[PDB]
């Protein structure tokens, strides 16, 4: 196995746990009406996830250039596309607070 895969798999798992922590941050803010600073804080955390997902596409892209026949290449591209759609769904939910 490649260390390019394991480092990519760990980052895909950590960003899935960062999205789940963002879900719980939304739930708490549906209770307390929240200040603009707290609303701007969850938004800045949302933009940080979009940046990490965008650089991960380049990370996965460098792996395809040096090893296009590596197994899990299709599942890693689909897992990143799901994380991007999951992050965007948290953006629309926040915009209604």
Residue numbers in the entry: -2 to 94
From the paper:
Here we describe the combination of rational and computational design to deliver three-helix bundle (3HB) peptide assemblies and single-chain proteins with control over topology and thermal stability. First, we garner sequence-to-structure relationships from antiparallel 3HBs in the Protein Data Bank. This gives core-packing rules, including layers of hydrogen-bonded polar residues, which are combined with surface-charge patterning to design complementary sequences for acidic (A), basic (B), and neutral (N) helices. Synthetic genes for these express in E. coli to yield soluble, monomeric, and thermally stable proteins.
Manual assignment of the subset of 169 structures revealed a strong natural bias: 121 had the anticlockwise topology, and 48 had the clockwise arrangement. Notably, in single-chain proteins, the predominant anticlockwise topology has right-handed helical connectivity consistent with the left-handed supercoiling of CCs. To do this here, we used MASTER to search the RCSB PDB for loops to connect helices in the AF2 models for the clockwise, apCCTri-BĀN, and anticlockwise, apCCTri-BĀN′, topologies. All had consolidated hydrophobic cores with knobs-into-holes packing between the core Leu residues confirmed by Socket2. Moreover, the conformational handedness of the two structures was different and as designed. The structures reveal that rational design can precisely specify conformational handedness, reliably accessing the more-common anticlockwise configuration seen in natural helical bundles, but also the less-prevalent clockwise form.
